[PDB]
Amino acid sequence: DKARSRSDWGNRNVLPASEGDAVLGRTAKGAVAVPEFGIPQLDDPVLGFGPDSMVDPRIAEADGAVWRWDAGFVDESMTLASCADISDEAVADEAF
């Protein structure tokens, strides 16, 4: 059945799989939905969050996407980043 009751949240249904299925008001985890982006301080190429300012390590644990049980955790052991570049000639000639 659809999630109808607020009483069946504990009985039958678990939580929204994708964030387009969230409750009226909130994100997929259940917290309030806030827009991701604020005003950037210090617009500047050399000193400022440019396009290639490297990612915060604390952006994932703050997300909760580093823990394996939470849905944000993507495992990269089977994705294309873990496949060998065949254009590398050290890897082609060895594997020929």
Binding site: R6, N11, V14, W69
Partner: protein
């Protein structure tokens, strides 16, 4: 750990940004839910021993092998440690409910729990049934209107039951 107001600050800093007026206006929508969030953890804390023992009684009525001689919840020291696990998980889902996100639940409770149960020989798929029976005992308690003013807290019920879902898929 992070709460829900600290999760937006860590995303904003990672790109060296201020917070826009659209982001502040979404954080004062989280403040206005403040008294209904405190009623939900108060109803879970105040009934916390009936959540645990009514749902453990239900767990052994329909899986009676766990308390037979040779089972895992046999020999009352392992029965007492079994009820300890359910109070522990209920404690951290209660922590993640006032915080607004599950990061204190993720690394202080669930981190390494699936691999702990495999080293003990504890059926981790039956621990997930134990968490799922505390899930709707806690939801039926939070939908219950006794002691509360009229109004609305239905997006918060769906959020509390999502921390019980995260705790139950991390253990199987």
């Amino acid at each position: 750990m992070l709460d829900a107001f600290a999760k937006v600050v860590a995303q904003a800093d990672a790109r060296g940004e201020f917070l826009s007026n659209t982001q502040i206006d979404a954080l004062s929508k989280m403040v206005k839910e403040g008294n209904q969030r405190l009623d939900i953890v108060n109803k879970v804390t105040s009934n916390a021993s009936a959540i645990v023992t009514n749902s453990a009684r239900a767990l052994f009525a329909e899986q009676p092998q766990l308390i037979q001689p040779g089972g895992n919840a046999y020999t009352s020291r392992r029965m007492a440690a079994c009820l300890r696990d359910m109070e522990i998980v209920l404690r951290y889902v209660s922590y993640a409910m006032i915080a607004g996100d599950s990061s204190v639940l993720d690394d202080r409770c669930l981190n390494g729990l699936r691999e702990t149960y495999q080293a003990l020989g504890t059926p981790g798929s039956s621990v997930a049934v134990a968490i799922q029976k505390m899930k709707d005992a806690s939801v039926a308690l939070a939908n219950d209107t006794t002691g509360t003013p009229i109004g609305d807290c239905s997006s918060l019920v769906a959020e509390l039951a999502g921390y019980f879902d995260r705790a139950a898929v991390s253990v199987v």
